[PDB]
Amino acid sequence: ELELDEQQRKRLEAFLTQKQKVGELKDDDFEKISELGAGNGGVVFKVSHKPSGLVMARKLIHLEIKPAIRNQIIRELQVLHECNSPYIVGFYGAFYSDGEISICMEHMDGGSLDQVLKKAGRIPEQILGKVSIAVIKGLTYLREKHKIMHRDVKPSNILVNSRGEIKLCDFGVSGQLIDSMANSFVGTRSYMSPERLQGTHYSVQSDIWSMGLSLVEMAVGRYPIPPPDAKELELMFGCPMAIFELLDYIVNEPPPKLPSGVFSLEFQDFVNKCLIKNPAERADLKQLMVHAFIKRSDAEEVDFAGWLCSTIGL
Ligand SMILES: COC(=O)[C@@]1(O)C[C@H]2O[C@]1(C)n1c3ccccc3c3c4c(c5c6ccccc6n2c5c31)C(=O)NC4
Ligand SMILES: [Ca+2]
Ligand SMILES: [Mg+2]
Numbered sequence: 001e002l003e004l005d006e007q008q009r010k011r012l013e014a015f016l017t018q019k020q021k022v023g024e025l026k027d028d029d030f031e032k033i034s035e036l037g038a039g040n041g042g043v044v045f046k047v048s049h050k051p052s053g054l055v056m057a058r059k060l061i062h063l064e065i066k067p068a069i070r071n072q073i074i075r076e077l078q079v080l081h082e083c084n085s086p087y088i089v090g091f092y093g094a095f096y097s098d099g100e101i102s103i104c105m106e107h108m109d110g111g112s113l114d115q116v117l118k119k120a121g122r123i124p125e126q127i128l129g130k131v132s133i134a135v136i137k138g139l140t141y142l143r144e145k146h147k148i149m150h151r152d153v154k155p156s157n158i159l160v161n162s163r164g165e166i167k168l169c170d171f172g173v174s175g176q177l178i179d180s181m182a183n184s185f186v187g188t189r190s191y192m193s194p195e196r197l198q199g200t201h202y203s204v205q206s207d208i209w210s211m212g213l214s215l216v217e218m219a220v221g222r223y224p225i226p227p228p229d230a231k232e233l234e235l236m237f238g239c240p241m242a243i244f245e246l247l248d249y250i251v252n253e254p255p256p257k258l259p260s261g262v263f264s265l266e267f268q269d270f271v272n273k274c275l276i277k278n279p280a281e282r283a284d285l286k287q288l289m290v291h292a293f294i295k296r297s298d299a300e301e302v303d304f305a306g307w308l309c310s311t312i313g314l
């Protein structure tokens, strides 16, 4: 299912063309255009690579560690240079400098589905059908060609742009970086599968669960954990807990689910097969790739770009 499209394949080569001319990334070649978002561990800025004129997203993570340690990280990130999927943010290059490690990539003017949600309030099903295909497709490539998991699926990790592109970002690739980052830098797991919340079996199934949870929140408009009362259900459509509480409520409670009537049965059944606790029972990639929801959505002609640009102003 990793086949390529004409327009897509043409866009994949474009990046390559540019990436070639850019050359070695140097700290003094960048110019801060603005801040994009606070990503746990470091910060993301909208920079300008003066020498090339290109606009990029520079991730900065301050890690005062031994040189060999740093030179090590940069060695691991060199892997992202091989990732070529229209469902994953284009990588430009990484490097260290004066205390910080820089991760330069492709800028996504659409932002994260996290912000998009806030703007829209709640994403339409037909739209969520495009995201599913994207995320679903992304994970496959991450495993198919790159034999690695994502390990961190959430609305904030789903970047989109004015071209109607949906790509994933924030997937671990450097063990050392994670090690050094694990220091003070630490994020939540409220989007993680229960299986992992027990040091048990964890594969793409863990990502598939993450997605399922995200899709619901985007569809409903809020975090679907725990299950919102009926007062809101009839409010939002017509019709708190501690980081450790949810972490367990997620393990000792019935998985969330999309409210009936408002959504399509196929979609409802789709998420459900995603939020199946037992990673063994939960649907696998190819299983979802051929799920009625994905087939119906893959066929639907949805102008994602238009709706997005209209939902955020763009
Ligand atoms: C709260 O926001 C986040 O966690 C983001 O994923 C979302 C936010 O910053 C983060 C840290 N982020 C990241 C966290 C980790 C890797 C990449 C990003 C990231 C990228 C971009 C943007 C972005 C663009 C426009 C508005 C906000 C944006 N962000 C990113 C990127 C981008 O255009 N290209 C990569
Ligand atoms: Ca400098
Ligand atoms: Mg993260």
Ligand code: NA
Pocket (backbone or CB within 6 Å): 027, 028
């Ligand atoms: Na600098």
